[PDB]
């Protein structure tokens, strides 16, 4: 497979520029970092909470393990 018989396009226009005629990293700090946040807010809720719970079962799993080795009053 290759270019030439993939599929159909009609009445679409493309505007593209050389790289030499433009900076490589325009608005890297300005527009990116707000876009990092918006990128972040849209994933954080359904990514962490499992890993959040993991921090607790890595927490309680060791604490409850430590106690079991300490003697009892008997």
């Amino acid at each position: 497979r290759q270019f030439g018989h993939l599929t159909r396009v009609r009445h679409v226009i493309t505007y593209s520029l050389s790289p030499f005629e433009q900076r490589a990293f325009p608005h890297y700090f300005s527009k990116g970092i707000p876009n990092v946040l918006r990128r972040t807010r849209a994933c954080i809720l359904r990514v962490a909470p499992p890993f959040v719970a993991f921090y607790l079962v890595y927490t309680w799993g060791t604490q409850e393990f430590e106690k079991s080795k300490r003697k009892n009053p008997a």
Partner: protein, 158 residues
């Protein structure tokens, strides 16, 4: 057909890659446009462009003197045969007096041409083709038309 001289033609006749193409040279006040126009079936664009770019690099690098005298002798039979009548003349006048200033008597063009040898071409084409930042246009089934980067990477031999 195949027996033509310009390699770009004999190939396109041999392999039937295209249907028509022409070069040009447009010239404006302190700049111009140098390049070409070509028309071909969608399954053959990328092949033509490699050949075209192959020739420019060939001319900027290895311009055989025997191939120069052709184009010199071709050009003479343009300006002359162009000036077979009055209307072509009166264009060249009315266009000369706003572009160059003085009209140029044709024995002046001829002297300028005979200065041209294969050493000059390798300098000129180096200045205006090699590694430059071309401009590209497209209108049609161009599914095979390569990206701008691939065009420029194909601009310099080696």
């Amino acid at each position: 057909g195949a027996h033509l001289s310009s390699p770009l033609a004999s190939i396109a006749a041999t392999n039937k890659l295209c249907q028509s193409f022409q070069t040009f040279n447009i010239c404006y006040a302190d700049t111009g446009l140098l390049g070409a126009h070509f028309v071909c079936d969608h399954m053959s664009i990328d092949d033509m462009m490699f050949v075209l770019q192959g020739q420019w690099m060939r001319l900027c690098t290895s311009a055989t003197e025997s191939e120069v005298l052709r184009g010199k002798n071709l050009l003479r039979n343009a300006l002359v045969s162009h000036l077979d009548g009055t209307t072509p003349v009166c264009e060249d006048i009315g266009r000369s007096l706003l572009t160059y200033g003085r009209r140029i008597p044709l024995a002046e063009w001829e002297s300028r041409i005979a200065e041209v040898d294969a050493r000059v071409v390798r300098e000129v084409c180096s200045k205006y083709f090699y590694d430059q930042c071309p401009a590209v246009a497209g209108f049609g089934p161009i599914e095979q038309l390569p990206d701008y980067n691939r065009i420029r990477s194909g601009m310099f031999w080696l």
